[PDB]
Amino acid sequence: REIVHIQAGQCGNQIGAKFWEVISDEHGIDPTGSYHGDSDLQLERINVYYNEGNKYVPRAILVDLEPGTMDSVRSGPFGQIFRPDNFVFGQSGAGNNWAKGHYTEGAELVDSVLDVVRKESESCDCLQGFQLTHSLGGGTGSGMGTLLISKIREEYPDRIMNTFSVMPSPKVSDTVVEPYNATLSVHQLVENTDETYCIDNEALYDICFRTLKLTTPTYGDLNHLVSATMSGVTTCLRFPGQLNADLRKLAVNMVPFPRLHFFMPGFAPLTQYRGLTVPELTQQMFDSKNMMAACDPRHGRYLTVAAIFRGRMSMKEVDEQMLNVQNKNSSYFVEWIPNNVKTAVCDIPPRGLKMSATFIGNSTAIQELFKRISEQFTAMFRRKAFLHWYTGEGMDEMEFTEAESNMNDLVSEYQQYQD
Amino acid sequence: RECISIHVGQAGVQIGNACWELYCLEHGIQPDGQMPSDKTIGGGDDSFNTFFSETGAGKHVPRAVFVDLEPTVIDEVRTGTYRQLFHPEQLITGKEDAANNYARGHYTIGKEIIDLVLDRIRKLADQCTGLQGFLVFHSFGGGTGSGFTSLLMERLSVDYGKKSKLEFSIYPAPQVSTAVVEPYNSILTTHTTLEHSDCAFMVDNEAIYDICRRNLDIERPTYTNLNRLISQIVSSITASLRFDGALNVDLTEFQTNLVPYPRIHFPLATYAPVISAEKAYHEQLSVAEITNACFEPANQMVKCDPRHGKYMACCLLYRGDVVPKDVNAAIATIKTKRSIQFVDWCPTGFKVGINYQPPTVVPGGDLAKVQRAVCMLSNTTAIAEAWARLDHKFDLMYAKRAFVHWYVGEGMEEGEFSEAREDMAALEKDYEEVGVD
Amino acid sequence: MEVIELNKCTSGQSFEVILKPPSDPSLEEIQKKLEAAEERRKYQEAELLKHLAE
Amino acid sequence: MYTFVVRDENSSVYAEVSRLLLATGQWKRLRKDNPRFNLMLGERNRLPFGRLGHEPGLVQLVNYYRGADKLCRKASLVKLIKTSPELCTWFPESYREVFLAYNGNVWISELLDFHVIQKYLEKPLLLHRKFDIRSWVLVDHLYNIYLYREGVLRPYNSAEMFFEEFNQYLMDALNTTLENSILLQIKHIIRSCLMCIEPAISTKHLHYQSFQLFGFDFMVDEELKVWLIEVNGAPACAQKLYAELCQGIVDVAISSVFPLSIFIKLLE
Ligand SMILES: COc1cc([C@@H]2c3cc4c(cc3[C@@H](Nc3ccc5[nH]ncc5c3)[C@H]3COC(=O)[C@H]23)OCO4)cc(OC)c1OC
Ligand SMILES: Nc1nc2c(ncn2[C@@H]2O[C@H](COP(=O)(O)OP(=O)(O)OP(=O)(O)O)[C@@H](O)[C@H]2O)c(=O)[nH]1
Ligand SMILES: Nc1ncnc2c1ncn2[C@@H]1O[C@H](COP(=O)(O)OP(=O)(O)CP(=O)(O)O)[C@@H](O)[C@H]1O
């Protein structure tokens, strides 16, 4: 059950690169690909994200319309570990236009990328599906990313499709036209992804600014929370244990209805030598200020929830905490889905933490995020502002209208069940 | 006469490995399969030959097949101590599991592997001179356990027709790991196998789990604990087939003695005494004591209150130092101080089998060896309580049609949910008619 | 309580105490259902591939 | 903190009890269908017990004893007296054809044309004033019998009074205390019924625990002998006695299981 990782665009390539670094450390793989871990656990499911001179190579394909981002990764610490042939980029760049990526200047490279993917999928003994990282509000990963997803779905319609999509935010914005690109991407994902982890570039900032007390968070700061969250969700897949989660089972248990495949990640300790108590981890995990999506769970209701606790800790005390939360917060849990919350414990703790907790929740509150994006789109789209940059590529206002609508429907759906 | 056991899903396999281990310890067969006690090298018609076969080398091989849609579990058997014991063909693994989906294991993945498993079963049947039936062990929640099992039930009902088949299903427990869609899977597989199953013993992980916390003082029972306790219970039931006895000596005797009506083929099990091996000295419970413990819900494998249900049949199976007089005395005492009521169409009686051989506990297990034990198999309407619960759950999800799509996507149709749910609803009415006055 | 059907053997004994007296589907049909799904499934997959082509 | 779910809105007594639970600052009301309730004011009819006591890491308690309808229902009560060996002079005879075997002969032909046939108490103790002795008895999860101290006594022709006042009349008019004249037989009657049905309804080892308040009707004759009329599974309470009894119910039953005497300990 190999997972073909795929990272596109600047943001996608930056966060994906750290994700590899982090999970390589945890799995005791150094930049050269050799292994030096002290426990076999590390090598027991390493094939989920690595392929083996007894060296593990990440099963990752890097994609970009400009060399710069991919060249930095190559120069990065683990730049060696990434397979050179898996590097796949062009020179045109996407000028931050979904169009330029999903239509004009991506249709070229997309084929090249599908070839590497095909090669990775062939070697895979049992292809679990595909993992993708991108920023819904840019050009290559917003637009070209959703294009590759569609292509991928046609070739591999029996595989799980999961995306770590980085929702753009005014607090951390690059261009006025970022809402437009997000709305188009959102609708692509609604239809061609089974699982999407919404990482709001807003929240991350907040967390950093407020909690972590960082006046001028840089993109690295946000990326650091992102890599941690990533390792979290991916733990059960990487490391063996009682619950050997897989993409399909993950979708089967957390997705009551297809369109509703957007999840609010949460992590604690938000970074330290004082290991938190199992009660502490459990209260922070569900803490809004510890969720990477900028939505209040109290404003909606948890369809489904899944927790993981890495590190040595009392399994019983863990179960007790979870039970308490559910019982004290019964109103925030859908009644129609019995037992909608489940927890799992991994012995290997995150890097540099004695113990942590990762939260994955399909809350109706997630609609807040899409409402924000929809309002922005509406603001500009009501006056057709900046639309010429897309109409120049051959797009049509109607297509903007459609995507706008769909994202509103999705918002409605989350509310329906909320009430 | 021989019993081919079939293990489907993780549970089945797991529990299986356990049952077969206990069987090899009871029957003094070494892990190599070489049984020193056995003097019929590669032959004989002894009682234990019902579940084992003697090779020309003198090794004995269980007459069962371990099969799962994923391999990692059955690979453990292949790499386990009893690895030699089991023949590779007996071990049938696949590439991908049903990912917790009845429809996925029954239709999508069921068809691909159904014939291969039927072939293996058939190779076993051919080696058997007179197959008594098949013992299927599985779990309601998992999608291999439910989907693929129910498909194998229909096939075995067709290919082996007459031969009898006893179930050993694992009712879903929220405390224990469980998928959210497990109530769906449970109803579906129930409905499909309801006519393919001669007698179904359910084991609620919720009950087994608390029993391990309570008697064995285990804070977080692992599957291993739970499976060991279950194996002790299976061994008590399978012991009439594996040893010489007049009670339940063939699979038919279980249905004849315990199942009055085909739909009500689910008998509640209760076992005593469960003692912690960590305790150095344990009070030796009497025949009357163990006998009475059988009438306590804590010692039931499926929580439910028999006081509010009529009995259709009851059988007590003692293992250890137990005499008929003790049993009669305990029965009498308990009857006077117990709220035991049998249906009118049934006589108030208890078929008692006693095996002089004492209970067998695995070395280093958390179960302390006892000098006597009893396991009571009684068909009470109270078991229908466990149906209700599951049913309720289903409903709550099915009203929103939550998680249905997945199944529908596997080719299944939304109507089948209603069919299976009606059938459970009938089965719940039947229980209430037989018992509720 | 009346004990009856008392059988003694080297392995064990059994008896019966009574406190009180009392007052299919054809393989084709199986397979036909399985194949039906197949089709239904296929239909869906086709629809998806056709939406992809559009 | 504690959670409770009120499923019996018509229950006045338990309505007050749930309000007190709210007042404690340690008890909060949940959705009637919310599974994660520590306590349940189940409905008087068709209360679901098969789903109780199966919620992981949750202690569940219910304001009714499963199987207690036998003592409560008038028809089951008579059967219970007659079938039960333990259960009987204090209970007025009640009724097939044996009723005719009629052969004082009042009961409570035309009647048969129009249930149970219990001989009417032709000679009733009159203060000529007929009164009904209402006693409230609560049974916790230990099946300890407790008898609310306060009681209510609810012209005659052959053809609400407090215990204290009634006792005063007994002493002034009959030279006797309510306790020795009537209240001793009440206790014996109560214990007899409850302890008879105790094995059948005991929740000691059951996965859910139970408790329930009962109202017993007693009729005293000219000889000051108490007579059981009916047992009420969901008895109301005197308006004045409501606060004390409900508060007591909360402290003895809700609080013993879920820790945050106006009663007589018949059993303990
Ligand atoms: C938090 O921990 C995780 C849980 C899951 C989901 C999941 C999601 C849920 C849920 C239960 C389950 C659980 N489902 C399951 C599967 C097989 C079973 N067999 N027997 C019981 C049983 C139960 C996981 C075991 O495999 C999965 O992928 C599943 O409840 C509502 O949301 C995936 C993970 O990866 C990202 C994960 O890591 C973080
Ligand atoms: N008692 C016991 N219960 C088990 C065991 N393994 C799994 N379970 C139960 O199994 C249910 C899930 O079914 P599985 O056996 O895991 O599923 P499966 O048959 O492998 O089918 P898949 O879904 O494809 O993996 C849960 O409700 C668990 O409670 C076990 O080894 N012992
Ligand atoms: N055999 C008898 N002799 C004399 N009086 C009787 C009697 N049976 C009943 N009564 C009186 O008639 C009334 C009817 O009895 P019962 O208690 O059944 O009333 P009821 O049907 O309203 C139930 P409850 O009074 O508990 O609400 C009682 O209050 C009692 O005082």
Ligand SMILES: Nc1nc2c(ncn2[C@@H]2O[C@H](COP(=O)(O)OP(=O)(O)O)[C@@H](O)[C@H]2O)c(=O)[nH]1
């Ligand atoms: N968290 C995070 N967000 C980023 C990062 N880089 C860019 N972004 C966001 O990505 C959006 C712009 O997309 P970009 O990376 O430039 O996409 P591209 O056209 O494919 O390169 C902006 O909202 C930034 O907020 C990063 O490294 N980390």
Ligand SMILES: [Ca+2]
């Ligand atoms: Ca032999």
Ligand SMILES: [Mg+2]
């Ligand atoms: Mg950029």
Ligand SMILES: [Mg+2]
């Ligand atoms: Mg499995």
Ligand code: NA
């Ligand atoms: Na070009």
